[model samples]
Target chain A: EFQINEQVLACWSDCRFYPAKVTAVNKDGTYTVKFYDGVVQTVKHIHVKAFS
Target chain B: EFQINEQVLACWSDCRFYPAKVTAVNKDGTYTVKFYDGVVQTVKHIHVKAFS
Candidate 1:
């Protein structure tokens, strides 16, 4: 999730681009991350792979 | 990324919806996860948060 931000910043961190707000909220035990770039995407949850 | 799916399925999991072919590939060590609902999100590395 944070990787995308890395790439974006690496390419355009000093361009004086308008500030964008990124938020990840935990609601009812679920996470909703909001990105501001006119693109709407919903992320459910985050977890590491488990072997049972 | 698994968390998002939990909510979507909790509300609707028995509709016999055609199985979506979502995949996560680790090419050169980065993870790319695709969702079934057309929400495209990129997760770099799944690591437990660390306090540095």
Candidate 2:
């Protein structure tokens, strides 16, 4: 599971994934993240890939 | 990329990953997979993990 402030690759649109900063660990099994283009969104685990 | 007949671990419900057989690779970036329980379904790559 991703913790706060972990860097991750997240997908938002068009199959494009961006390097994002994980902000919060949600209680509902989803993550809140902020992307490169100033987009902060809550995403499921499927939409986020933690650093390998 | 997973080819036909490639064994994969796929998730459908909860956080459980099941051993599945890749039946077909879809054009829209999803895959058709079959579970041991004989359930055939389409899943995105995020829902699958190939053999390491």
RMSD of 1: 16.1
Per-chain TM-score of chain B, candidate 2?
0.86
Which regions of candidate 1 deviate over 4 angstroms?
A1-52, B1-22, B47-52
RMSD of each: 16.1, 7.3
Give the Cα error of residue A45 in candidate 1, in Å. Answer: 21
Task: List lDDT for all candidates, in order.
Answer: 0.29, 0.80
lDDT of 1 by residue, A1-52 (tens): 3322221111111112222222443454332333355443333333211112
Model 2 lDDT per residue over B9-42, tens place: 8875434567889999988989899998899978
Please tell me which predicted candidate would have the highest TM-score against the true structure. 2
Per-residue error for A44 in candidate 1, Å, reads: 18
Per-prediction DockQ comes to 0.03, 0.04
Q: Candidate 1's error at B15, in angstroms?
A: 28
